[PDB]
Amino acid sequence: LIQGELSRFF
Amino acid sequence: LIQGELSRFF
Amino acid sequence: LIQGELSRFF
Amino acid sequence: LIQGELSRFF
Amino acid sequence: LIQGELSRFF
Amino acid sequence: SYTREDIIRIAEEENVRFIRLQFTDLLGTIKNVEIPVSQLEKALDNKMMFDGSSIEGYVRIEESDMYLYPDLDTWVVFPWVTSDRVARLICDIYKPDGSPFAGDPRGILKRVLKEAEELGYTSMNVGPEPEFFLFKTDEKGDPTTELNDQGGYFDLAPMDLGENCRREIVLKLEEMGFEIEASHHEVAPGQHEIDFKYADAVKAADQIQTFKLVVKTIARQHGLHATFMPKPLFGVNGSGMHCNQSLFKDNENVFYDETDELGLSQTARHYMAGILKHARAMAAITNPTVNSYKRLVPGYEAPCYVAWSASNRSPMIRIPASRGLSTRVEVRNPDPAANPYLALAVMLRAGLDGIKRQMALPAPIDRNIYVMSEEERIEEGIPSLPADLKEALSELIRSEVISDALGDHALAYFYELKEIEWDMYRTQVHQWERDQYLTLY
Amino acid sequence: SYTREDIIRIAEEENVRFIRLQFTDLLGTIKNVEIPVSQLEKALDNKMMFDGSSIEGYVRIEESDMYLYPDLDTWVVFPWVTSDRVARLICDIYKPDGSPFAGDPRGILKRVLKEAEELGYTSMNVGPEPEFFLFKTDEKGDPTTELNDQGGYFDLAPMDLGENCRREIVLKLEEMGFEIEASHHEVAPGQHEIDFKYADAVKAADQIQTFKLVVKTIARQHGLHATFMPKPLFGVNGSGMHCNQSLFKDNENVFYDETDELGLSQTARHYMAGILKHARAMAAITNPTVNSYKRLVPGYEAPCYVAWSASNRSPMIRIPASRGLSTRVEVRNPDPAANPYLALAVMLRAGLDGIKRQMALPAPIDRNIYVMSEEERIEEGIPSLPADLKEALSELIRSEVISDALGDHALAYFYELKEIEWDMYRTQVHQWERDQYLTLY
Amino acid sequence: SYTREDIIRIAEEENVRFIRLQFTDLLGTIKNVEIPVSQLEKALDNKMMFDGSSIEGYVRIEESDMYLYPDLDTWVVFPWVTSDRVARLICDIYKPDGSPFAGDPRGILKRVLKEAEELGYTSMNVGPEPEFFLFKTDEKGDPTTELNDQGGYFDLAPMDLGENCRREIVLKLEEMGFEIEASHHEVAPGQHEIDFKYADAVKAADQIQTFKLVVKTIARQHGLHATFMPKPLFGVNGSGMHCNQSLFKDNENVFYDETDELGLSQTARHYMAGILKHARAMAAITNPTVNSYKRLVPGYEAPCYVAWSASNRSPMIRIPASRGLSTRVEVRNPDPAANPYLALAVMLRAGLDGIKRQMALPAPIDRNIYVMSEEERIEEGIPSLPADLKEALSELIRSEVISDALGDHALAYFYELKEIEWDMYRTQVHQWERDQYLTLY
Ligand SMILES: NC(=O)CC[C@H](N)C(=O)O
Ligand SMILES: NC(=O)CC[C@H](N)C(=O)O
Ligand SMILES: NC(=O)CC[C@H](N)C(=O)O
Ligand SMILES: [Mg+2]
Ligand SMILES: [Mg+2]
Ligand SMILES: [Mg+2]
Ligand SMILES: [Mg+2]
Ligand SMILES: [Mg+2]
Ligand SMILES: [Mg+2]
């Protein structure tokens, strides 16, 4: 469900 | 026809 | 029908 | 004959 | 008409 | 408002030297005819002829002759003109016989609004939420792949990152006559959103066009590049153009019903049902580009299934908590690349078709995330949006309701444009294929 | 208008120091004799002698003596002169005996207009549509192969692409006295069009010459290169100079006929039939260069067949939808490289010849695209325009109607010039040949 | 000569590992099917199938199946193979039913020779004079515009300029089985000519193909580029392939007649009359490329008019002073870019058609150089060769004699190929046009 929000770790 | 019209893809 | 054959002019 | 004028092509 | 023959001067 | 004498008065007073007679083609691009101020009276007399076949885009076949009918209420003077003032007028396209051109998107929206008024609905109140990305340019002035900042949702970086090219855009729009609600940083890095106050449908679409033009110009001024591409980068959030809609009948919100459990009238429910049934047919208009369907992928808040909810990860239709005169139906499919006139027209026509047939609203989707299998999804009757432009075009062709909204002339040319675009796209060999293959095989 | 005393008054008031006595040669190039203001009275007395053989171009054989007869109505002061004001006057060429020179293109157009007036047509109203390309220059100031922008038809570019230079040209032309109708971006990138209001034929040709000069100067000022070359690039649209014509008899449009189905009088139909009959003969004048026939190829809206229509891909003659006093016949063969005086003269002469012999108008071509075979084309009696300069020259020589329009002196020199040009072109070995061959053979 | 057992014997002895089954397409290009030595017996049994549609060039529409019938007399082993010996065989194309393919140029020449034998002429003795240019290459190995030397007619520069890649080519050809007559420097810098002894028509064409291949390979070995392009440079002499022909009937030269004033039999005069009558029709075959007609311009000894003489600047047909068994008719139109089989076939067919109808020989052209006007030329009945490929193609289509020589299948495909080539060429915008225009207009 969440992918673009977790971009901070990537 | 439309040869010069399709120049945006070329 | 002949497109890839006419590549010599292109 | 009129060669001094044909310099535009040369 | 000698044109290509006179190429030595040109 | 404005009148002919008023327009002439400001033109003389403001020292306007050049006037842009703006119109829009089927792809949403802003086209114009430049005019010296000495031709202002001729323009205001609805006597200017132009090709008119430029609406069809690159699939136009023959040159026509059409008249520009400027809308006096759309007059505005650009603030950056400085030395030689430039003004603009948004015009409707008319055939030489006097009837409006059937292929003009603004005329299409006006016709749909007229047939809405025929049912007693005075106006359609629309508030859009367009989002855009800011990219850094190179020495040659071309966009690079680097975002202007690395902020997050509602972040605040006053120096040069959080606001950046958002304060001056809002200031210029306010000077231009816009009613700005609020601005904030969007979820993805380099992504920003500016919201307007609600207006009537035609005014809302005109404001969307002007907003895109102004944002692009101001971003170019600061050495940046502004794009309304639906999905400029892989793995980050895309840009949407959520449209909030409410039908009005003489300053009365017909969507409101205090007696209803959700505060929704039967008219609103029929509207939502009509939009839901015709969603797949509308997708080719609200999501017109090939890149539009790279946004419609799970995990980035973009809708991927045809369903409605009051609270969900990404429903097709969302109902905001506001009630009373501000009860609205939010449709989240459109991206900023869509033509505002055509998108509003097809959404309104689908809603009116739902209203006319007393269509039954399906049950809302609860907090049940769509991790359920496809068997569960079609068992519960949850349709899915088209996976690419080809499916959307096929659904558009098969549809008899929103094809009528487009009309016979515009449908054929839009279909030709999109078919050509898809055909050019599908035969390309992309770098991804050369990365996967060319070594393994 | 102006008078001798008026001209002297402005010359003293404006501090004009230098005067250009402008004229045109057979190739359309603008030639001039520079004059100090102290010789203005001598110039206005029609007493200035010059070579006059410079009209023939590079095929001039002997020096002559000819007088310059300035036209007082053509007076104008250039705006960019700044420090030392420079003015211009357009002059007619007269033999020393007092008769006008038969080889002067302006005199040729005047003579054709006189023989038109002999039939009762007081004036010929002409509106041209010249298109041009803008190229970026290098450090040395030479045109590169890169366009100034990448816009499309009627595209909007408020930064410095489509407009900017275009706006400056329009502003300068307005000062000069040019009544500008409208300006816009053309189909091909870097291509622009500026339209003037309609004027009499001589004034229209003078305005075309002045417009070309002004556009070139202003483009050079901004570090750009403006060209009116018919086909500067392969694969993109060329530049045309569509000429709109209407015959007038005492401010009455003789082309108009309300009773006709198309609103076209028998005079207009005879005019169009005459133009169609002599089209192949006029091709050498309206399309004078070798590059002119690289534009006349299918797929780029340039006409390739001698036919007329009200709506088609690319008819030779198009009839705009406007009626009343604005009913017009648009001829689309000419390119901006053509001599305006000679082109207008031959077109008017062909139309008058059609009127005199009462030629029957052939049937218009429908939406039947010319994908039909050559057998179908010559079965329906559709002629084709010449494929190159040689065919056009042969048709010019064989023609007895428009060769009379040119006259005996100008025809021989034009034929010599074009024959030399074609002979120089045909013996060249181009890079395309070295690319195809030199490896395969 | 050779036999199957002989071929196998040399293949085993010479350690031949690879065999080229060579054939020719309609454009004269050398095509081949590579074969391992283990398939030599299968090849010699006439059992190898290939596409066969490759003869048509780039206009082939469907894949066919055809057999290769090697000619055992054409066996040769290339000298530069060194480590792994490579041999070649020239093959005829046969349909699967057993009949020869009608589109094979070698079969076309064989059929014309057969119908010549039907009139009693046992053989046609042909000696060609192909000329070529040598260009210096760059680091990447591509031909530059600089000639390898600056010698003149019959010049002598022993060091690296005069012979250079002419001694080695002659040596390799001699080792290959050629009978070389002489070699010398040609008109233009970097132009060389090597002459072979006379042979039968099929052998002559095979030798021409092999000679072109060998010259190209050897020139590439020395870091040079060899081209048979008819006119690689403007202002210098082109390359021709003058063909000397004589008809033989049982080792008797039928062209010889001691009693005649010129030593020419009536058969030879009829042959020459037939060649002159059909010259414009044969031009599309003997001068097949666009660049071929840049050579056919006055002042460089290439023929430009259809006439014959014993001593002139550039006659179409020249008769050498040799008599007896060496009396010959030299046709000077062909350039080395022509297909040898097709050129010899059409020339022989035209000569035989002249013989059959007993055409009257026109009067020879004396030392009257063609400075005479066109009126003088068509008053004396002197035709001119086509000015470009389009005229030659039209004459080819209109001709019923040499189109029969080509046959129905080959004519259509040759016409399609040349039409496509001309259409591609005519729409190009060359640098010469951008030099003349783009500044003056
Ligand atoms: N509203 C948000 O949180 C962002 C929405 C998301 N950008 C979309 O494309 O729908
Ligand atoms: N869109 C148009 O009509 C442009 C016409 C085109 N440029 C020509 O040369 O004719
Ligand atoms: N003078 C000669 O023999 C050379 C012939 C010339 N190179 C040609 O192409 O015809
Ligand atoms: Mg948002
Ligand atoms: Mg929203
Ligand atoms: Mg135009
Ligand atoms: Mg036009
Ligand atoms: Mg020779
Ligand atoms: Mg010879």
Contact assignment for G59 to D2 by CB distance below 8 Å: yes
List of chain F residues whose C-beta atoms are within 8 Å of the C-beta of residue G322: 49, 65, 96
Beta-carbon separation of A3 and F188 below 8 A: no
For residue G234, report the distance from its CA to the centre of ligand 7, in Å. Answer: 21
DSSP state of G336: T
Q: What subunits make at least 3 CB pairs under 8 angstroms with D? A: G
Interface of F with B in 362-391 (CB under 8 A): none
Task: Report whether residue G333 contacts ligand 2, using a CB cutoff of 6 Å.
Answer: no
The residue nearest atom 1 of ligand 2, judged by CA position, is G187
| H156, H162 contact by CB (below 8 A) | yes
Closest by CA position to F302, among listed F316, F284, F318, F288: F316
Q: Where are the alpha helices (DSSP H) in F222-289?
A: 266-277, 279-286
**3-class SS at G308?**
strand
Name the H residues in 305-324 with CB < 8 Å from any E CB: 313
| Residue G230, CB-side half-sphere exposure with 13 Å CA sphere | 29
F240 Rama sector, left if φ>0, alpha if ψ -120 to 50, beta otherwise:
beta
Contact G299 B10 (CB under 8 A): no
- For an interface test with G, the pick among F17, F22, F32 (most G C-beta atoms closer than 10 Å) comes out as F32
Atom of ligand 3 nearest to the CA of H237: 7
> What is the distance in angstroms between the Cα of G426 and the nearest Cα belonging to chain F?
35
Q: Are F96 and F73 in contact (CB under 8 A)?
A: no
Technique employed here was cryo-EM
**Rounded to 5, what percent of chain G is helix, strand, coil?**
35, 25, 40
For chain C, the helix, strand and coil percentages under 3-state DSSP, each to the nearest 5: 40, 0, 60
Does ligand 2 come within 6 angstroms of the Cβ of G181? no
Edge-to-edge strand list for the sheet holding G85-94: G30-36, G16-24, G85-94, G66-77, G48-50
As given in the structure block, the two tokens for residue H34 are 């590579």
Q: How far apart are CA G43 and CA H431, in angstroms?
A: 43
In 3D, which of F93, F89, F95 has the Cα closest to residue F55? F93
Assess contact for H104 and H33: CB atoms under 8 A: no
Cβ atoms H90, H74 nearer than 8 A:
yes
Set of chain G residues whose Cβ sits within 8 Å of the Cβ of D5: 57-60
Determine phi and psi for F93, rounding to 5 degrees: -100, 125
Helix residue ranges, H only, G338-373: 340-357
Question: Is G270 annotated among the ligand-binding residues?
Answer: no
Cβ neighbours of G155 in F, within 8 Å: 29, 31
Distance CA E4, CA H186 (A): 11
Q: Which residue shows structure tokens 């004033």? A: H261
Using CA atoms, how far apart are residues H73 and H210, in angstroms rounded to an integer? Answer: 14
* Residue F190, strand partner residues: none
Task: Identify whether the C-beta of residue H332 lies closer than 8 Å to the C-beta of residue H313.
Answer: no
For residues H290 and G431, give the distance between their C-alpha atoms in angstroms, rounded to a whole number: 12
Min Cα distance H257 → chain E (Å) is 34
Q: CA quadruple G7, G10, G13, G17: dihedral positive or negative?
A: negative
Question: How far is the alpha carbon of G103 from chain D, nearest alpha carbon, in Å?
Answer: 19
**Residue ranges of the binding site of H for Mg(2+):** 129, 131, 186, 193, 195, 242, 330
Q: How far is C-alpha G99 from the geometric centre of its chain's CA atoms?
A: 26
F124: left (phi over 0), alpha (psi -120 to 50) or beta: beta
Q: Do F235 and A10 touch (CB under 8 A)?
A: yes
H292 lines ligand 3 (CB under 6 A): no
* Sign, CA torsion G254/G259/G262/G263: positive
E strand or H helix at H418:
helix H408-426
Mode of pairing for the β-strands spanning G48-50 and G224-227: unpaired
Nearest to G299 by CA among G145, G189, G184, G187: G187
User: Which G-chain residues 122-181 have CB contacts (< 8 A) with chain B?
Assistant: 152
Handedness of CA B4, B6, B9, C3 (dihedral sign): negative
Is H131 near ligand 3, meaning CB less than 6 Å away? yes
Using a 6 Å cutoff on CB, does residue G240 contact ligand 2? yes
Residue type at F370 in one-letter notation:
Y
Binding positions of H: 129, 131, 153, 181, 186, 193, 195-198, 237-238, 242, 246, 295, 301, 313, 318, 325, 330, 332
> Which residue from G402, G405, G415, G393 is spatially nearest to G102, judged by alpha carbons?
G405
DSSP state of F101: P
- How far apart CA H343 and CA H329 sit, in angstroms, is 15
Q: How far is CA H285 from the centre of its chain?
A: 10
Ligand 2: nearest atom to the Cα of G332: 10
Q: How far is Cα F223 from Cα F218, in angstroms, rounded to an integer? A: 9
Q: Please state, in angstroms and rounded to a whole number, the distance separating the CA atoms of residues H174 and G344.
A: 70
Alpha-carbon gap, residue G49 to G72, rounded angstroms? 18
What angle do the packed helices G340-357 and G279-286 form, to 10 degrees? 170
Contact call for E and C: 3+ CB–CB distances under 8 Å? no
Mutate-to-test residue for ligand 3 from H193, H239, H312, H335, highest number of ligand atoms within 8 A of CB: H239
Q: Which tokens go with F78?
A: 């650009």
Give how far Cα H42 sits from Cα of F59, F329, G377, H72, H350, Å: 57, 79, 54, 14, 39
Locate the chain A residue with the closest alpha carbon to F153.
A5
> In Å, how far from its chain's centre is CA H55?
17
Residue partners of F158: CB distance under 8 A and separation at least 6 = none
Residues having C-beta closer than 5 Å to ion ligand 4: F 193
Selected catalytic residue, list F92, F129, F163, F353: F129
Q: Rounded to a whole number, what is the largest CA-CA distance in chain A?
A: 16
Q: Which of F185, F192, F225, F242 is catalytic?
A: F242
Query: In whole angstroms, what is the distance from residue G298 CA to residue H378 CA?
Result: 36
DSSP state for residue H64 in the 8-state scheme: -
Q: Check if F323 is active-site.
A: no
For residues F396 and F403, the answer to whether their CB atoms sit within 8 Å is: yes
Residue G395 sits at φ, ψ, to 5 deg, of: -65, -40
What atom in ligand 1 is closest to the CA of residue F186? 4
CB of F58 less than 8 A from some CB of B = yes
**Are F34 and G166 spatial neighbours (Cβ–Cβ below 8 Å)?**
yes
Task: Please choose, from the candidates F339, F333, F227, the residue with its C-alpha nearest in 3D space to the C-alpha of residue F278.
Answer: F333
- How many residues does the structure list for chain H? 441
Instruction: Tell me which residue has its CA closest to atom 3 in ligand 1.
Output: F187
Helix (H) or strand (E) holding F144: strand F143-147
CA distance linking residue F399 with residue F175, whole number of Å: 43
Q: What's the token pair of residue H359?
A: 């055409």
